[PDB]
Amino acid sequence: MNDKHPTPDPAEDNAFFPSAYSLSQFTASKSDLSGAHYPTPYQGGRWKILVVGADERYLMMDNGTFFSTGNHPVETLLPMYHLDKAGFSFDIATLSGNPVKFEWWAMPREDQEVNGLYSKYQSSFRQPLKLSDVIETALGEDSDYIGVFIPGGHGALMGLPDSQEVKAVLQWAMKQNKFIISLCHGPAAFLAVGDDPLFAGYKIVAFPDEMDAQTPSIGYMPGHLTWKFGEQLQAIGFELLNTGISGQVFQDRKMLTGDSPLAGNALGQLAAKALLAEVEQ
Amino acid sequence: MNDKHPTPDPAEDNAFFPSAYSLSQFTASKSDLSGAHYPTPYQGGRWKILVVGADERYLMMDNGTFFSTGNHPVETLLPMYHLDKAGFSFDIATLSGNPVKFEWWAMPREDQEVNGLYSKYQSSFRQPLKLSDVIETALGEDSDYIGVFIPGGHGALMGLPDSQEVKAVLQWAMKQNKFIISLCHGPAAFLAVGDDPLFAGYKIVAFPDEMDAQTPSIGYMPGHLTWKFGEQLQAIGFELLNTGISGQVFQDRKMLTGDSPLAGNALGQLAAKALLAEVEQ
Ligand SMILES: [Ca+2]
Ligand SMILES: [Ca+2]
Fold first, then answer.
1. Separation of A225 CA from ligand 1 center, angstroms?
2. What residues make up the domain containing A172?
């Protein structure tokens, strides 16, 4: 019937990609990548950013259907594109060690830059590191990581929110005064700290729970979320600054966040700027 | 229809379902489920069977492509169907806690009984237990599990083969003299014991490595497997009984195995009979 009806995903029974209508409204063939040139990039070849991606594509909705989601490609690749041009490298990990799952329906197919960057890291996205291995060997006081990046997309709502491994990564980042970068639903991962109040008083921007309750009306999702990461984040001490979305980014000490799928470019510029200043002395 | 070109999976880039031709030869609209009749089933309400399923659908081939696989639905459901009728219940788990991934292209869409069983267990396949929790509170000397079932499908080749968690489960099963039920590629999970000579001298049937070497020739998979589970199994003590496949099964003490996607029904009968005789003593 309607272009607003969820689109069946052939690989999983009772699973759906966003409706044709929502895709035309919420995705585009090109990204708005801009100002990604850095005249004095980091050239030390040491500092890297740890990327923690979603290893699951199917998210259970309140009505039993699966939302065929995963990490948002634009939210993931724009920040990475800027950091790449800034001279930084990446290690990609998932909780299980299984492939990072992208919402391919949001990939800007006509964007040469974004597609070129994915291809650059495709072997890592497809065969990522298992977070437990990273925790056991690449963190600590002498880590080569200058920060951690947790991309958005509803895929970040699975596993990451209550993973004891993610908790360890976040505590490490805070303990070693490392950058924590995330946007949209990515901050849901912060809930991994459980009852630990290490994020008390922090200000961030994140996708509004209010909007998650509305997007299903046009078939962006085949149902509604079974919980609210925003209210949960507020429960552990976070202050959510944005009522709506406009690509706004915020920096609270070393916590850098973006508000939605509109903040990829701005977050990339902010992170690149922040990390570059950090490496210079 | 006769097309032997792997079929692109829309949900994942460079991922492929079996070719239309291989599907017409290796899958059917109906299963050969039969003889699932046990006049005096187990009604003690205690003994259950733990199912360790595949949580990943995308398997990396030797040529960079992803085989869109997972657990084989017929191999999974026929054994369960017989055991269900025999009066046993199931607990379904995956390593990550993520949903069990089925090779839906092998699901017999016109098999009313098979689809009826899936309906009964869909909530468990879709929101399975996390194996780590199972090991922590449901095993031990007083477990309610009478056996473990590890279904086939190439998805069994991911994570399970070198999982310390699967190792614990196998060590427990052998120590507590529990049934271990598997077929086709499921035995690859037995490799999880690593270097524990636990299965030394056991006889099993499993999918022939040499057949795996040939199915890609008709587009069943988009490439070839990066390793051979059969040789690895022999390397840890197993005597592989079958050279080819015919859907036969073998019982060596409490180790029950099927040889391929043709062994689902026979394995259900073998397992149901062994477990029923067990509980009847
Ligand atoms: Ca989104
Ligand atoms: Ca098969």
1. 13
2. 1-281
